Design a protein around this ligand. Structure first.
Ligand code: HEM
Length: 82
């Protein structure tokens, strides 16, 4: 099965308690990854609650980074909001 979230509910996860963001229509919960991110947490918090696909691809993450990102996927963006 697959869980779908709307932009409306995703935007609510941008506080000290929860940090979600969208990348290529997938929703990631990076709450616990903020302090481990080699790129720092400020760059993630700034994109929280929205689509950060361009900024993500702009930096050109390595293969290993993309493999690791999969562990943080909690669902996908609802088809109606794409
Ligand atoms: C999906 C979660 C993400 C994972 C697993 C992740 C992982 C990493 C890793 C492992 C690196 C080290 C370099 C590399 O291997 O490419 C890195 C660097 C970096 N990340 Fe991320 N990242 C994520 C999302 C993002 C997002 C959304 C942004 C910005 C909007 C971002 C901005 C950066 C920057 C600026 C660097 C440093 C690049 C440099 O020093 O040249 N990352 N990230």
């Amino acid at each position: 099965a697959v869980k779908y979230y709307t932009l409306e509910e995703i935007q609510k996860h941008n506080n000290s308690k929860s940090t979600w963001l969208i990348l290529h229509y997938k929703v990631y919960d990076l709450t616990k990854f903020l302090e481990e991110h080699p790129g720092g947490e400020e760059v993630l918090r700034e994109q929280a609650g929205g689509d950060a696909t361009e900024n993500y691809e702009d930096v050109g993450h390595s293969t290993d980074a993309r493999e690791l990102s999969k562990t943080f996927i909690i669902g996908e963006l609802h088809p109606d909001d794409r």
